[PDB]
Amino acid sequence: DEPLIKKLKKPPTDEELKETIKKLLASANLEEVTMKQICKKVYENYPTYDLTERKDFIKTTVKELISLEH
């Protein structure tokens, strides 16, 4: 053990979270995407994170883009 340290571990600001999703819908039909797919992909980019509150936002970011921007 020596090189293993890990010092960076913070949640991505909304600018980052939204960016991740903006990439998901940008690769799929909004009316054909569901909140379930957003959480799956989103986590893919946010694996080492405890997205709990900001998570409810992600799913809501697409669900609102499909109802107010299908």
Curated annotation (Swiss-Prot):
DEK-C domain sequence ranges: 11-67
Name recorded for this polypeptide: Protein DEK
| Record note on quaternary structure | Found in a mRNA splicing-dependent exon junction complex (EJC) with DEK, RBM8A, RNPS1, SRRM1 and ALYREF/THOC4. Interacts with histones H2A, H2B, H3, H4, acetylated histone H4, non-phosphorylated DAXX and HDAC2. Component of the B-WICH complex, at least composed of SMARCA5/SNF2H, BAZ1B/WSTF, SF3B1, DEK, MYO1C, ERCC6, MYBBP1A and DDX21. Binds DNA.
Which residues of the parent protein does this chain contain?
309 to 375 of 375
**Associated pathology:** A chromosomal aberration involving DEK is found in a subset of acute myeloid leukemia (AML); also known as acute non-lymphocytic leukemia. Translocation t(6;9)(p23;q34) with NUP214/CAN. It results in the formation of a DEK-NUP214 fusion gene.
Compartment annotation: Nucleus
Residue ranges flagged as DNA-binding region: 29-43, 59-63
Q: How is it modified after translation?
A: Phosphorylated by CK2. Phosphorylation fluctuates during the cell cycle with a moderate peak during G(1) phase, and weakens the binding of DEK to DNA.
Q: Which gene encodes it?
A: DEK
Q: Which domain of life is it from?
A: Eukaryota
**Tissues expressing the protein:** Ubiquitous. Expressed at relatively high levels.
Q: Which organism is this protein's natural source? A: Homo sapiens (Human)
The record's function comment reads: Involved in chromatin organization.
